[PDB]
Amino acid sequence: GPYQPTTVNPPTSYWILLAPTIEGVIVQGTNNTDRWLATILIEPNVQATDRIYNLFGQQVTLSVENTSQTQWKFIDVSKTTPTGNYTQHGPLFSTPKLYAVMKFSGRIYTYNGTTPNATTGYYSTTNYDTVNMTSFCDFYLIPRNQEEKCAEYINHGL
Ligand SMILES: CCCCCCCCCCCCCCCC(=O)O
Numbered sequence: 001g002p003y004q005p006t007t008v009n010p011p012t013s014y015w016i017l018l019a020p021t022i023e024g025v026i027v028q029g030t031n032n033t034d035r036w037l038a039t040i041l042i043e044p045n046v047q048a049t050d051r052i053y054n055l056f057g058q059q060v061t062l063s064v065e066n067t068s069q070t071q072w073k074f075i076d077v078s079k080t081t082p083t084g085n086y087t088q089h090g091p092l093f094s095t096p097k098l099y100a101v102m103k104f105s106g107r108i109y110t111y112n113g114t115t116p117n118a119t120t121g122y123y124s125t126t127n128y129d130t131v132n133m134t135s136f137c138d139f140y141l142i143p144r145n146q147e148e149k150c151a152e153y154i155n156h157g158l
Pocket of ligand 1: 010016027028029030037038039076077078089101102103108123124125126131132133
């Protein structure tokens with residue numbers, strides 16, 4: 001990398017390492033059947049607030065917060081129908097402002113917790129293997145077999 005913002009359908013067993021700079025929707029993806037997914041970035045020190053986000057072309061109001069005074073915050077969101085409500089999942093508090101996602105074994109793997117001690121976790125409520133990706137930021141590809149490097153960049157930056 002870095003790869004410029006684009007829409008692709010990433011391969012399974014690859015980490016996409018996203019390098020956003022501005023708060024808001026950094027990436028979104030869908031399988032056009034049962035999942036519309038995104039990750040939102042929130043700057044430090046945002047008390048509970050209704051914010052409007054363009055998700056898949058629609059203006060969506062989400063109640064969000066970031067209680068961290070020093071770190072940025074990634075939140076995953078998901079809806080299961082075109083008109084469904086979004087639910088928030090898996091906060092990552094981040095100093096490097098990097099976020100990674102991988103489709104593998106039907107699951108989506110991400111990093112969770114607080115850098116520099118963020119750890120991998122995953123979602124598994126359906127098979128996500130065919131979910132595509134529209135990235136609004138520059139990104140890198142890291143194969144599963146070099147995942148240790150991915151964890152390194154998430155927690156410590158490039
Ligand atoms: C490579 C795929 C990219 C998909 C783009 C969005 C990246 C974040 C993934 C968020 C998953 C949301 C959690 C789903 C909750 C659930 O339904 O189990």
